[PDB]
Design a protein around this ligand. Structure first.
Ligand SMILES: [Cl-]
Ligand SMILES: [Mn+2]
Ligand SMILES: [Mn+2]
Ligand SMILES: [Mn+2]
Ligand SMILES: [Mn+2]
Length: 134
RNA sequence: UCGACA
DNA sequence: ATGTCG
C-alpha cells in the first residue's frame, strides 16, 4: 500500500541534541530533491519537523499534490498543530535551530496546503528512503 | 508504571 | 544514551 508517487523526508544527526540536517527524496527513485545544510545544534524531532515543513514548501512551489512520508510521529503531530513543542533549551547555541523552527511554524500559520502527511510504516516497509541512520 | 515513534 | 507522544 506504499504510495510511490510521493515525497519522503527524514532527519539525520550526529548526537541528539547534536548536529542536525535533513533531506527529501523521490520515494519511487530515491533521487535527492533537497537537503539542508547541517545545523550545529538541534534535536532529532526539530529536524524531522523542519524536513516535513520544507517538503510542504517544496511541493507547493512546484504545484505538486503528492503526499509526504515521514517516520516521525512527533513531527507529523507538530505540523498538524502548526506548533513544534520542542523543549530544547533556548540559548545562544540553539538560536539557529530555534529560528528555523519558529520560521517554519510562521510559514505554516500563514499558508495553505492539502498535502497529506503520511506515516511511513518502517516496521513493514523498512527504512524510509530519505534515511541517514544505520 | 509503562507503551510507542524516532 | 536523548527527543517526544499516547
Ligand atoms: Cl529549515
Ligand atoms: Mn526519521
Ligand atoms: Mn547532508
Ligand atoms: Mn515557535
Ligand atoms: Mn532515519
Amino acid at each position: 500500500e506504499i504510495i510511490w508517487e510521493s515525497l519522503s523526508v527524514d532527519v539525520g544527526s550526529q548526537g541528539n541534541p547534536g548536529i542536525v540536517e535533513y533531506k527529501g527524496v523521490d520515494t519511487k527513485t530515491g533521487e535527492v530533491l533537497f537537503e539542508r545544510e547541517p545545523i550545529p545544534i538541534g534535536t532529532n524531532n526539530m529536524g524531522e519537523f523542519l524536513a516535513i515543513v520544507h517538503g510542504l514548501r517544496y511541493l507547493k512551489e512546484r504545484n505538486s499534490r503528492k503526499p509526504i512520508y515521514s517516520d516521525s510521529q512527533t513531527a507529523i503531530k507538530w505540523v498538524k498543530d502548526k506548533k513544534a513543542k520542542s523543549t530544547l533549551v533556548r540559548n545562544e547555541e540553539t538560536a539557529l535551530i530555534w529560528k528555523l523552527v519558529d520560521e517554519a511554524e510562521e510559514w505554516l500559520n500563514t499558508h495553505t496546503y492539502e498535502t497529506p502527511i503520511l506515516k511511513w510504516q518502517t516496521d513493514k516497509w523498512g527504512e524510509i528512503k530519505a534515511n541517514y541512520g544505520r
